């Protein structure tokens, strides 16, 4: 259902754009009120952490404190994709970035709140 | 609090996910002289006239389906046990589905409810919305709920 | 009513046709301590400071052309006999007549008015709209008018 | 004024240019029992609970290519902390699309109402502000006001 | 000025759609704020009774208690018609159905409040 | 930058339309929130006086007491012009009419509040 694109190597202080495409069922075709799409990251030997969230319906967002003001989560209704623009990158931003979705409105930003996941994409921030 | 009058001015938790969660543990938020916040509801400590009010702020970007946005204040009696709407308002913001390639412009919709009601001791007041995905509590003073005995 | 303070919280008659008719003969509607409802107007029983408020809810489906929606609270003095606007608001939902085949999606426009005024004994308060064809009093808590001596 | 309670109900100056200027020198406008209007702000005369409220009315004709962000905020300026904090805040964005080249600019209207109960200190300053005076509509009475009442 | 279409025979429990078209002077051409269109019914040897009302401007409606939830009054701007969709029909729904209009906003749902009437359409609900 | 058109002779009780076009830098592009356009008039040996103001953004207006209800200031977005429709003209309305602009929002209707002026157009109201 979910597929992440973009990613790879970037210089510290640099920018990168990640994309999450919904394959199979479109984000517009929900049984509930909307699809809730989240971006997560897992640094080697560290627990999976929340990055940003967007509702497909409203486009309303929530960011982790360390990404607020530098990262931007957006939705492309026409291309049925959820993009994550990451600016002011730093070596500890290196992790595998995952896209997650839920057909409904989660009452938590926990990794446990999402059932459907993309395969993930490596983002490496180095000289 | 220098006043003897039951009061509340609760605010949306900016950290809550996909819900409108009322909080008194913030600066410029009140809960005094018997008023309680139990299951996201304001509990009336004594009989009398109360000014009840609430504001919600809705936000969206572009337009999808027709969007029906509600905001209601309801009374839950100790005796009748039933839920009755005291104050209610609706907003349906999407005039047309954003065309395939047109730029999604962010829209904003505030709703204010308020009035004087005779309430009984133990009555519960609820200030609810139907679409938490459209709710905007990102900044202070945008979404609140309060009561004051008069 | 346990309070000694003049009060009113009147509500639109859901059974009224093509008019905004204020009613106190409903549950969660007030009229106490001298306040009267005479010719669809609230009559001030004594001098003092009053918090005056009103809400109307407008509803339409599509756009006919211009749609100018007003909501006003006015003071009618016993002495000067003149009508002066205390609280006033305007809403224009329709930017252009809905194109020939475009979908008529139902829209909703609430308006809230409220403020503190020094009033005289015998003064009349009116809460009026200009377009009853757009008024939405179909459900409880949507359109109300109230006062409280402070 | 027969009441002993600090009060204010100030209104936009209809004669002011490109600004939201609060006035008490009008009929059906209040300023009593210690409340002052100093630098376009309401000054709290004593500690206590206050019901604070404000309404603004926005107006435009047609829509520009740019998006219009309309704000209305009531904020507290403390005597002690000296900082400005928003007590009541609301936003409106009236223009879904740019008015087509030859289409008639139909006039739109957007009211905003703010109101709540707050514990205030003696000497605190209350400000009711907007960001776009070019969209403000104070042409007629009762459209834009700001008030407080000690409870 | 007014002409009702649709109607006739229907099985109890069945549905029927009535239409009211304005000829000559369209509902879009009013001197007042709007045209108010009402649907009425007259069962044999019984007084004419209110069924539903619609404002041509807003599309705001009012239904008689016995029809609220099963009947729907709608306004079709482009085709200059007022439709009445009648579901959950019963033998006592048998009556001649009339369309009525007023160039203005009536302060009553009384038959006396409307001056202009259609010729009527027979609706028979039977096995 | 500013050029007034229209004007000339008109019979008392007559109407006249003045236009103010922005040359070079059009009213559509401003560094500020909007361009504020004002119409002024100067009768011989009398001080320049305010007539009407319009904000290019909103189209919100202000009129001098003696012109309110008879004059209308409008903004023609398409033709990038600010028009002044003058009705119920009287001999003492004879003056040179000037168009003035400011890239921003003035806090006064004073002649001093505007820096950029058109050359002016003569308006003569006589038999």
Author numbering:
A (entry chain E), E (entry chain F), F (entry chain D): 3 to 129
B (entry chain C): 7 to 70, 72 to 157
C (entry chain A): 7 to 71, 73 to 157
D (entry chain B): 7 to 157
What is the paper's account of this structure, in its own sentences?
Tumor necrosis factor (TNF) is a pleiotropic cytokine with beneficial functions in immune regulation and host defense, but deleterious pro-inflammatory and cytotoxic functions during inflammation. TNF signaling is mediated by binding to two cell-surface receptors: TNF receptor type 1 (TNFR1 or p55), expressed in most tissues, or TNF receptor type 2 (TNFR2 or p75), which is inducible and typically found in cells of the immune system. To better understand and rationalize the activities of the three Nanobodies™, the crystal structures of the complexes of VHH#1, VHH#2, and VHH#3 with TNF were determined. In agreement with SEC data, each of the three Nanobodies™ associates with the trimeric TNF to form a hetero-hexameric TNF-Nanobody™ complex.
In contrast, VHH#3 binds to a different epitope that does not overlap with the epitopes of VHH#1 and VHH#2, and that is located toward the thinner end of the trimer, “below” the VHH#1 epitope. Each VHH#3 molecule contacts only a single TNF monomer and covers 736 Å2 of accessible surface area of TNF. Again, all three CDR loops contribute to antigen binding, with CDR2 being dominant and CDR1 showing the smallest contribution despite its relatively long length. VHH#3 binds to a different epitope, and its recognition site on TNF only marginally overlaps with those of TNFR or VHH#1. There is no overlap between the recognition surfaces of VHH#2 and VHH#3, but steric overlap between the bodies of these two VHHs is still significant and should prevent coincident binding. This explains why VHH#3 was also identified as a blocking antibody. The shortest distance between the N- and C-termini of two VHH#3 molecules bound simultaneously to the TNF trimer is 51 Å, suggesting a minimal required linker length of only 12 amino acids. This is in agreement with 125-fold increase in potency for the bivalent construct with a 12 amino acids linker. Interestingly, the construct with a shorter nine amino acids linker shows an 80-fold increase in potency, indicating that the N- and/or C-terminus of VHH#3 has sufficient conformational flexibility to accommodate such a short linker while still bridging both binding sites. The bispecific Nanobody™ VHH#3-9GS-VHH#1 can bind in an intramolecular fashion to the TNF-monomer subunit, whereas the bispecific construct with VHH#1 at the N-terminal position required a linker of at least 20 amino acids in order to achieve intramolecular binding.
